[PDB]
Ligand binder design. Structure first.
Ligand SMILES: O=S([O-])[O-]
Ligand SMILES: O=S([O-])[O-]
Length: 220
């Protein structure tokens, strides 16, 4: 009923535009759905070298890849073989705003990902456009249903030069392709995302995420 393997390939193409700058990015990677770990090699095919911080894009490059325990419904693994899509708002504290789409589908041992990323109102002297971002801090997503739709909220923070932080609020909606796929209870998903290596101008990046679901206190 699932057909999600313990090892899967990941195939991804992103087209997008931030502060007027258009780009295209390709990803080929591998992951381990049931351990909640994945890794990806990203390559810019148009719009390079990007005039903005690469970190803003990186959560755009699948909650399938998260370790769900048994007492929590796993909507993402239950949305296959047919797949699902998500939509995200990234509200930055200094007025920068991004919206994002991923349409996720499966052929054999490979997830396919049609991704769209649009950003604006980023200040010219901000960390994004000055490229002063170091990494996303690990996070904790909250998952809840709001009018028959699974929703994730995250207080994200980008570490900057000098250990300052640049805030971002995520809200993501998640939508199974198949009707009447069972919504889960209110729960959490810890994340940690990480650029493992990158070339100088970020035309080549190697990314890794690790995520695990939990009920919160007292259970976790
Ligand atoms: O857990 S992360 O730092 O690889
Ligand atoms: O479950 S709480 O009340 O400790």
């Amino acid at each position: 009923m699932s057909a999600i393997k313990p090892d899967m390939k990941i195939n991804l193409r992103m087209e997008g535009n931030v502060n007027g700058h258009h780009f295209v990015i390709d990803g080929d990677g591998t992951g381990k759905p049931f351990e909640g770990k994945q890794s990806m090699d990203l390559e810019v095919k148009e719009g390079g070298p990007l005039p903005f911080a690469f970190d803003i894009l990186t959560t755009a490059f699948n909650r399938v890849f998260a370790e769900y325990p048994d007492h929590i419904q796993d909507y993402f693994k239950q949305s296959f073989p047919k797949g699902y899509s998500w939509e995200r708002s990234l509200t930055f504290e200094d007025g920068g705003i991004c919206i994002a789409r991923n349409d996720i589908t499966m052929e054999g041992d490979t997830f396919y990902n049609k991704v769209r990323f649009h950003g604006t109102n980023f200040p010219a002297n901000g960390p994004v456009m000055q490229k002063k971002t170091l990494k996303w801090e690990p996070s904790t997503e909250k998952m809840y249903v709001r009018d028959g739709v699974l929703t994730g909220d995250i207080h994200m923070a980008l570490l900057l030069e000098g250990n300052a932080h640049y805030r971002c609020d995520f809200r993501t909606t998640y939508k199974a392709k198949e009707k009447g796929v069972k919504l889960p209870g209110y729960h959490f998903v810890d994340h940690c995302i990480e650029i493992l290596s990158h070339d100088k101008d970020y035309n080549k990046v190697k990314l890794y995420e690790h995520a695990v679901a939990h009920s919160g206190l007292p259970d976790n």
